[PDB]
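Bug #2210: token dump truncated for Formimidoylglutamase?
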Amino acid sequence: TWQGRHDPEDGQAGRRVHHIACPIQVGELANQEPGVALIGFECDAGVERNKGRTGAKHAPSLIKQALANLAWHHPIPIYDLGNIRCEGDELEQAQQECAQVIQQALPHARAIVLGGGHEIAWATFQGLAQHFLATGVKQPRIGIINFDAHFDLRTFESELAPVRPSSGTPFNQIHHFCQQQGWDFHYACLGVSRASNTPALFERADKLGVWYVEDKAFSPLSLKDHLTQLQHFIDDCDYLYLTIDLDVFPAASAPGVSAPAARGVSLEALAPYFDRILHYKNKLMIADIAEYNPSFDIDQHTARLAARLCWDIANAMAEQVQSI
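Reproduced locally. Full output below:
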């Protein structure tokens, strides 16, 4: 149930998210007024597999609760399609189950997936990819923009060690998928920490032609350089998939995560980039917010931060709906 603060003295103008948030089955989405879809991914099995600190499986509801009380400035509804819960170490199945909801939702609304670990990215991409295949988009040019301190391009299948898909392999899996479909792997990793990624990961990134900006490269002086790079990245694709790993932010701003950023890139330093991406509300098909771990949050700081970001994206999606 979506509930929150009520200010009767304001009438219909005191509209908040809970006033227009509507829990519904993705199946009935085809019969509703066009809105923006919300999906939860309660899973941190990938986090555990990638040797991180578990807890993100409980994040979806807390982010939704925080979101419920935010003011809503659009006559557009928000459809809560529920949460896909991972059972045990059944990561792969959980990711496809989530992808299933996304695929059904995409024809009627753009979606925001709120999860546990960044393993959510494989679920989101699959949902997006399967939607394209199922709707005749033969060779989609998808721009994947990830704000993460990590490349998360780790190997998931190796005859050198016993590895498996995890919170650190999503984007490698995405590249693999693209290769076999004959699609381009257009990937941008912004805010990457060279102290958090070994030489192997940087080598893999260069090999795959990934465009990345290190945490230390963000500054008022380099904005011109990087926004232009961002612009060109955007110019070369028809669809955008925005994925935010909360561990990209300074530990002070996002304490509730598996690996609090020892350095990070401030929300304000990243804002210009977010604003540029969200301007292309036409191309923005989907997005997700990863790694919120309630177990390490402080007075719900991270939860609210995640809700504000979710809200920023929803506004862009909501404006697109009204645009058409």
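Output looks complete on our side. The beta strands are 21-23, 36-42, 78-85, 111-115, 142-147, 186-192, 211-214, 239-245, 284-290. Marking as cannot-reproduce; reopen if the truncation happens again.
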